Design a protein around this ligand. Structure first.
Ligand SMILES: Nc1ncnc2c1ncn2[C@@H]1O[C@H](COP(=O)(O)OP(=O)(O)O)[C@@H](O)[C@H]1O
Ligand SMILES: Nc1ncnc2c1ncn2[C@@H]1O[C@H](COP(=O)(O)OP(=O)(O)O)[C@@H](O)[C@H]1O
Ligand SMILES: CO[C@H]1O[C@@H]2O[C@@]3(C)CC[C@H]4[C@H](C)CC[C@@H]([C@H]1C)[C@@]24OO3
Ligand SMILES: CO[C@H]1O[C@@H]2O[C@@]3(C)CC[C@H]4[C@H](C)CC[C@@H]([C@H]1C)[C@@]24OO3
Ligand SMILES: [Ca+2]
Ligand SMILES: [Ca+2]
Ligand SMILES: [Ca+2]
Ligand SMILES: [Ca+2]
Ligand code: NA
Ligand code: NA
Lengths: 413, 413
């Protein structure tokens, strides 16, 4: 128009406020990594479901005290005992085996001495108990860890390996979760060739599509590759319509500044009738970043039209797209983690808030990491942070090596 | 035997020293996430491959100075111009378009005023240049960003999205990388049922297999599910032989303490003829953790026999297995990231170094994160750290809330 310069705060809040939460589906628990539960999950059994030994040793009567005992048998892991321990008797137990009737404590083998075994040294017959056990010692009573009827996982839980293991424990193998967003990515520009092409005069290879798709995939979301689209409104409209049909989220790059052949914003508004919430952001890089929604058939589609410059595209993808995707897949607080780190070099501040990929490194002595902006060993590592520099003011015009700055985590630390 | 209590330092060093690096394979660049390059990668083209405009504006002769100029045409993105700019002339350019012959600078449109356009307002004819440009301004010369013949990625680089984008840029779509390890996981114990089973007397559901497989999958490595194996040497040997055939790494859990039906270490030594490098570790939890190698047909197989206790299994998997897998897939320094964090509560120290899953959280004010050991909102989050508590000494017997401790990162922050 030009569109108003939207502040970074307002643009980010607008993305989260306008992005929908996807519907739910039932999945197998093994497919639950990174999913958010849409239901509370309850145990239908006690854990342990029988009183269970914590130790290799003997199930005893605490009231017998220390002394010499006849071993009446062994409680085997996986088998309910049938014998009752009576005074002067014990039963051998292993870790995880059930406690027999008549015993109220376990004495670990280290607190015993063997007296007699069968001539074939395969059976223990008599043992000396060297300690006074307390009732209940080294036994997990029924339900000690989980009780039947207990809610073991709450709706809203963002699951990792231990939550999957908990579902396995309680036998809840099918769970309701939010869907993951399907994200379509297209590149735009008459100068672009595919990565697989040799160069032709006036042309370059499309890198943004690969970088953006890889970024989305790294977060676990399914993607659709919509290819390269030329700088013309008909082709852009057709590609957007395909994205809308096939995906929940459409990411484009290129064609969002005010250039003679930058058509995306016109197509979004005039042809698609999408609502453009912002078309410029007061940020460096990323000035022409554009965010639109399209409500069709009771469904809200999300469209990010990112800048064409490759660094701008990947930075703005991490700032705006990834948090939106996290909200869509049901994460209750979708904001990225921000950590404090020390600047590795002096920096002159821009009037705009400025963002730069960096590598966070901890030195085993120092409490704060260093942020090295993108060495023989550092060239081996991928960026895992986005430095977040404050706007310059009449007071603060520069920051110095060692000073503390905010860094958004964008990769595995 | 019992096996010697191996110090944590020695056990960890032994794992890394004895673990092999896998062989290489050629992959498509799109499949490169998390891979390590086994070759240097070179650009075969310049970037840009033509002198490219940084701006929407006009390609000018700097020597003409400011003034009124005839527009002789437009350089289009993706098209080599054919006209030569002569004195008193300019050519319209867009960002990324080639600079025509005869021009040596770009003046952005904001530093100009239009004089005349065609009656049909679709063609600019005459423009006022308001600034004195410097030769080269707002042009990326050929090779400014990447030069033909330049090494753009070194062998040993652990690739993320931006490295994939760089491969796309230079058109190197096939790259040599280290293989990922195939990791087989089995559970052991006569008391175990599958997650899909209803409980039977004396039995519990196998959770370790799910938790361990999910942990490995979270790191991107292919897995093989070897199921549940009973406490008997024949079945254990057969399952290990299947793992050895199908996988690079075999993980078991259970059956590694000194109990009457704990057979794994006997099978590994006597039947498989594997070399057990350690069979106990002075750590809490994880005392019976076992690490073995098996050299067969010039190939080194890796076997981790982890403790059966579910918390021990997941802790020891993160401490020993994940670093080994990182070395196998070619990461040069496979050690996890260790960060400094503040303890959320007082802790009594054990004679053994102690490890506990926790959640790291940053508060937007404070420089160090807090480590909360595994709240309405915190129950929504998965563990992302492993607290690393030091052994007790005659001097240090306890640590207090707020004191700084080491935390190993085990999840996305
Ligand atoms: N997919 C892409 N891969 C690599 N470079 C790109 C890609 N798309 C655009 N570019 C380049 O980025 C720069 C800006 O492109 P442009 O389409 O003008 O972005 P915008 O108009 O959104 O600011 C140009 O140099 C252009 O060639
Ligand atoms: N896969 C599993 N899932 C859940 N619990 C398990 C699993 N394997 C073993 N356990 C339990 O862990 C505890 C220790 O098992 P055990 O086989 O004695 O380990 P180890 O001998 O290696 O110390 C027992 O209570 C046992 O039932
Ligand atoms: C409202 O926008 C402000 O908060 C936001 O939330 C968080 C918690 C998360 C990171 C970051 C968000 C990605 C962009 C906006 C900035 C700030 C400008 C951001 O910083 O910190
Ligand atoms: C040699 O073992 C010591 O260093 C190791 O390396 C690092 C850098 C990485 C984490 C951790 C490793 C997983 C276990 C051993 C500890 C220590 C006991 C560990 O701490 O810090
Ligand atoms: Ca363009
Ligand atoms: Ca443009
Ligand atoms: Ca067992
Ligand atoms: Ca055991
Ligand atoms: Na930009
Ligand atoms: Na253990």
């Amino acid at each position: 128009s030009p569109f108003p310069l939207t502040s970074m705060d307002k643009a980010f809040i607008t993305v989260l406020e306008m992005t929908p939460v996807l519907g739910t589906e039932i999945i197998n628990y093994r497919d639950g990594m990174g999913r958010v539960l849409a239901q509370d999950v309850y145990a239908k059994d006690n854990l342990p479901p029988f009183p269970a030994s914590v130790k290799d040793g003997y199930a005893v009567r605490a009231a017998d005290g220390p002394g010499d005992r006849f071993i009446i048998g062994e409680s085997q892991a996986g088998e309910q005992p049938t014998q009752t321990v009576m005074p002067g008797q014990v039963m051998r137990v292993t870790t995880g085996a059930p406690i027999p009737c008549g015993a109220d404590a376990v004495v670990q083998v280290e607190d015993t001495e063997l007296i007699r075994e069968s001539d074939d040294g395969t059976e223990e017959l008599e043992v000396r108990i060297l300690v006074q056990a307390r009732p209940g010692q080294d036994i997990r009573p029924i339900g000690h860890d989980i009780k039947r009827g207990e809610c073991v996982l709450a709706k809203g839980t963002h699951m990792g390996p231990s939550e999957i293991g908990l579902l396995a424990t309680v036998g809840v193998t099918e769970v309701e979760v939010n869907k993951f967003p399907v994200v379509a990515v297209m590149s735009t520009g008459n100068e672009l060739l595919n990565p697989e092409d040799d160069l032709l005069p006036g042309k370059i290879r499309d890198s943004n599509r690969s970088t953006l798709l890889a970024t989305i995939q790294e977060h676990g979301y399914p993607t659709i590759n919509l290819g390269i689209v030329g700088d013309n409104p008909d082709d852009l409209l057709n590609a957007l319509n395909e994205g809308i049909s096939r995906a929940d989220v459409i990411i484009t790059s290129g064609g969002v500044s005010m250039g003679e052949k930058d058509y995306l914003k016109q197509v979004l508004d005039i042809d698609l009738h999408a609502q453009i919430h912002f078309g410029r952001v007061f940020m460096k890089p990323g000035l022409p970043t554009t965010f639109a929604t399209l409500d069709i058939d009771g469904v809200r589609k999300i469209i990010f039209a990112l800048p064409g410059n490759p660094v701008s595209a990947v930075v703005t993808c991490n700032l705006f797209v990834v948090p939106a995707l996290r909200k869509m897949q049901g994460i209750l607080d979708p904001r990225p983690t921000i950590i404090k780190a020390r600047l590795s070099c002096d920096v002159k501040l821009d009037p705009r808030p400025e963002y730069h990929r960096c590598i966070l490194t901890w030195h085993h002595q120092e409490p704060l990491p260093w942020a090295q902006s993108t060495s023989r060993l550092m060239s081996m590592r991928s960026a895992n942070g986005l430095l977040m520099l404050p706007p310059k003011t009449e007071q603060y015009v520069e920051l110095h090596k060692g000073e503390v700055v905010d860094v958004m985590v964008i990769g595995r630390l």
